[PDB]
């Protein structure tokens, strides 16, 4: 459960990402695929090499979805229903994979936002990402 | 842990810039702030009620120094982490009963602290290398549960 | 007692001077001295039998000798006990083999809390001769003008940027520094790329002496120069923007060049008022249309 502090911390930090969100998105995916190569199994016919436009494209989708989450931080179950359909109903992603990508997003954010990635903000981003994850991994139709 | 030449030089080149009196206290501090139940293991350290309190707790900083010390030790013995960490594994598992999930969590907060300090030098392959190290350490520290 | 710093032997096959155009260093110095690019191959203290090769910078003093940046020739690191950080206003210089003394801003090691000490593409400080004359300096990787802020859109620099800096003098065989506290108290310089001007004040104290106020300073590409004043004297400002642009690992532009800044202020031949300074970009905005040097907040 996010605190009120947690919500503003997440809005502020993610607000700073601005129109580089697709780049943060793609870098977190690249970090995931390299650090944890079992995660690649979910993308069986992607090009997952260093340059890949496909990873880039996908990263922007992920990053935009998170921006949508941040904008609807109070009612994420309703906001993210279609993505829960995809990840829990269709794809059946093991939740461990969401911890892996969440960790990689945190690392991406630490590397690019060193003023903003304080201990308190790190704490909120982690809680936020865990909450997003829970929603995308739940069947609640 | 097998590191590649490129990986190994990358890890060590970054490790060389780590301020060994501060970075350990940082990582431990973030553990206590991001995963607050870990505070219970350090009830003896006094005020941990606040992120600033935590991060400025001199016993946190002191104790962090020792945990980084152990990771530094680890870097010289990547091929015998279990042996090297045997005494510590007994302390943490048999005596404190730390849930081993928390060893993985600290490994990961340390990785976040590295990236925080080194920014664009903490490239995806450099991270992947550090993941192998922190996973090695956590598993070695958990050995007595296995 | 502080140990004696011995000159680096650049004759070693481990230390090899860097003649690439992209590693070209620029230095502003009251009485000579320059920062100089090397590739340096050294063993790791953490894994034996390794040799690590990295790009680095050394300081060449006026007497011709080269020095590295280490614990003892850099500004006392502020204490970490509280959330708060104070920079001590007075610091010892490190005695050299030559008779001289040295101070510089920072090492390449990690730290927290005080951004103006976390320089990655430049150094500043002072060298004192065996004769007690001082050459103050500031030097580094100049900010390539093709990737200054506004250039992507407008083909020339545009907007404003605001930097947080520390000034340094030498007084009584000690390095003395402008007031710096976490900001709570610091020194801010703002570049206006619309007008080509630089404004701001290096805030003095008991030890540093009087503040240095930027009076009329013009900016052109990645250089600036002009006048400052301090305690009714006029000094000459010379300086530059530093640091290459920052890119995402994709190659896309993340931050423009010139994320660091530095210079000297010269009040007179061997005047003890003479200063170096350096610092880091705290806010920028290419689409700013303001025509003054008021600070970004
Ligand atoms: C913050 C976490 C995540 C977010 C916000 C997210 C978001 C999305 C979005 C927006 C899409 C595309 C839906 C569309 O096309 O409109 C998508 C597709 C996908 N996601 Fe996720 N996702 C996340 C985590 C994961 C993880 C951890 C995995 C697997 C390891 C995963 C696997 C996939 C796959 C396989 C697709 C479909 C790609 C295809 O077309 O083949 N996702 N995700
Ligand atoms: C890889 C992770 C870790 C490493 C390398 C590590 C290392 C160490 C080291 C070197 C000591 C000092 C023991 C001595 O002086 O002989 C220690 C003590 C301790 N560790 Fe850890 N540790 C880790 C993770 C954890 C975690 C996750 C917790 C709790 C959540 C924890 C709780 C403690 C406690 C409570 C002590 C106190 C011992 C005492 O006060 O007598 N450690 N650890």
Residue numbers in the entry:
A (entry chain C): 1 to 141
B (entry chain D): 1 to 146
C (entry chain A): 15 to 196, 206 to 320
Question: Paper's wording?
Answer:
To investigate the structure and function of HpuA we crystallized the carboxy-terminal portion of the protein from N. gonorrhoeae (NgHpuA-C) and a full-length homologue from K. denitrificans (KdHpuA).
We solved the structure by molecular replacement using KdHpuA and oxygenated human Hb as models and observed a tetramer of Hb bound to two molecules of HpuA in the asymmetric unit. Additional interactions involve KdHpuA residues on two other loops with side chains of Ser-94 and Thr-124, making hydrogen bonds with Hb-β Lys-61 side chain and Asn-19 backbone amine, respectively. The HpuA-binding site on the Hb dimer resides on the opposite side of the molecule to the observed Hp-binding site36, suggesting that Hb:Hp would bind HpuA equally well as Hb, and that there would be no direct binding of HpuA to Hp.
